[PDB]
Structure 1
């Protein structure tokens, strides 16, 4: 499974598939996703 990030704290929640959506050392229950690596092809125009 992967890592997720909370809306406020941002700490690594690294939480497991099929469980409960929340955090660890805090509160609130949302979370976005770390940006991939990832060297991405971008024209300057």
Structure 2
């Protein structure tokens, strides 16, 4: 499974598939996703 990030704290929640959506050392229950690596092809125009 992967890592997720909370809306406020941002700490690594690294939480497991099929469980409960929340955090660890805090509160609130949302979370976005770390940006991939990832060297991405971008024209300057």
Q: TM-score, normalised by structure 2?
A: 1.00
Let me know the Cα RMSD of the aligned residues.
Answer: 0.0
**Shift of the alpha carbon at 1:28?**
0.0
Map Cα deviations across residues 1-45 of structure 1 (whole Å, 9 max, x no partner).
000000000000000000000000000000000000000000000
CA separation in 2, counterparts of 1:44 and 1:24?
A: 41
The runs of at least 4 consecutive aligned structure 1 residues that moved more than 4 Å come to: none
Gapped regions of structure 1 (runs ≥ 5)? none
In the alignment, structure 2 segments of 5+ residues that lack a partner are none
Q: Number of aligned pairs? A: 45
TM-score by length of structure 1 reads 1.00
